[PDB]
Design a protein around this ligand. Structure first.
Ligand code: HEB
Length: 396
């Protein structure tokens, strides 16, 4: 029979073996979602790029109530992953206006200070300690706090509801809706506060520009902001943590960064290629009859791509399952492809480069505290593949 999603991960920080199995047997494979509906998964690099840039695979149709469920937030609000066409383009323009090059430059010292303080907390601790609880989670929460113009504690409360918003089959049906309502109320209240008293933050600049341009309704802005919050907290945390786990397991790769900090930028490209934050992408629904890689898909078929699998495709990368932070050229699609490609790719690259430069400079002899085989996935039923904890140690 056909395989069921979520797939197993005997190694939590590595892709599910099912991905390579399908990649080397069927380019468009049927899979059974937890809701029972059958969907088709695309796993090859060239094919994944084609689907993500093929407007016949629409996120809007995936947000339609009749469409099968995957992540609740997509069907509960006009998220950026719930729309297409001119409506989506207009929202991305506004977001791109806020994430302008001047904004990135101004954020460089802000990120450096957040990284410094988190690493100050690590150095002051007595090893072993959970790197995730002490460093990456505070960093991810405090970065989003700067984007939203709120206090770090406020983002911590928001993050509690993010798991429900991205729950494929982890959280109960009743608690999802109650945690979703709380998440919406928080974001709604934040937006209204910033509209009344805009500050020096990304959210305020977008809210002010939209108010002047009168191009998005308040509900559409909330939908976009919800997407930013859901995608901007857990994903950086998962990549940093899982990425570090790979760096400390393949310990010779961590040492390469210690040896030459000028190559950390290149290493970040390999980190995002090698440690994606999800197993498959958000749901798409085919709107017309199409033929993809010799496979016919009728209108209404639910479709999934796997950037995780694409970034391991031996047709695009030499020795794709090897972690090589010096890999160059490295033409991955870790930040997506097509209209829904990550709007924060430049911001995220700067953030990860700042962090891994500082970490490797201050903790050159960092090590895994316990065996690599003891790592566990935080939540199999979550869209994210972040691990439960990463215990590390260093000479004292
Ligand atoms: C702040 C905020 C933020 C941040 C930080 C981030 C970070 C990130 N990210 Fe991002 N994203 C986002 C926000 C975000 N994000 C959004 C909102 C989206 C959606 C867009 C659209 O849809 O249009 C995305 C999208 C996206 C995608 C696509 C998906 C699909 O298509 O389905 C991907 C792949 C990614 C990745 C990523 C990474 C890798 C990172 C790091 C590392 N992203």
């Amino acid at each position: 029979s056909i395989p069921t999603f979520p797939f197993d991960r005997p190694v939590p920080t590595e892709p599910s073996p099912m991905l390579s199995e399908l990649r080397n047997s069927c380019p468009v494979a049927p899979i059974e979602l937890p809701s029972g509906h059958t969907a088709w998964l695309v796993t090859r690099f060239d094919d994944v790029k084609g689907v993500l840039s093929d407007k016949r695979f629409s996120c809007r149709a995936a947000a339609h109530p009749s469409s099968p469920p995957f992540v609740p937030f997509v069907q509960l609000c006009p998220s950026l992953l719930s729309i297409d066409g001119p409506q989506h383009t207009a929202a991305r323009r506004l977001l791109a206006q806020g994430l302008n090059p001047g904004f990135i430059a101004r954020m460089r010292p802000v990120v450096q200070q957040i990284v410094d303080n988190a690493l100050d907390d690590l150095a002051a601790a007595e090893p072993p300690v959970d790197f995730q609880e002490i460093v990456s989670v505070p960093i991810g929460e405090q970065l989003m706090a700067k984007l939203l113009g709120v206090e770090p504690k406020t983002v911590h409360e928001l993050a509690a509801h993010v798991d429900a918003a991205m729950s494929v089959c982890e959280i109960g049906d009743e608690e999802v809706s109650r945690r979703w309502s709380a998440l919406c109320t928080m974001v709604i209240d934040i937006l209204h506060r910033k509209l009344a008293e805009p500050g020096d933050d990304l959210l305020s600049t977008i809210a002010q520009a939209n108010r002047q341009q009168s191009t998005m309704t308040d509900e559409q802005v909330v939908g976009m902001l919800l997407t930013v919050v859901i995608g901007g907290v857990d994903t950086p945390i998962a990549v940093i943590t899982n990425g570090l786990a790979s760096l400390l397991h393949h310990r010779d790769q961590y040492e390469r960064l210690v040896e030459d900090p000028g190559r950390v930028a290149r290493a970040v490209e390999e980190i995002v290629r090698f440690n994606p934050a999800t197993e498959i992408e958000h749901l798409r629904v085919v709107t017309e009859d199409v033929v993809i890689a010799g496979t016919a898909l009728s209108a209404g078929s639910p479709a999934f791509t796997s950037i995780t699998s694409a970034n391991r495709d031996s047709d695009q990368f030499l020795d794709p399952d090897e972690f090589d932070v010096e890999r160059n050229p490295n033409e991955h699609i870790a930040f997506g492809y097509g209209p829904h490609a990550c709007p924060a790719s430049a911001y995220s690259r700067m953030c990860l480069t700042t962090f891994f430069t500082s970490l490797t400079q201050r903790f050159p002899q960092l090590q895994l505290a316990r065996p690599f085989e003891d790592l566990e996935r935080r939540g199999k039923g979550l869209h994210s593949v972040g691990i439960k904890e990463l215990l590390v140690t260093w000479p004292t």
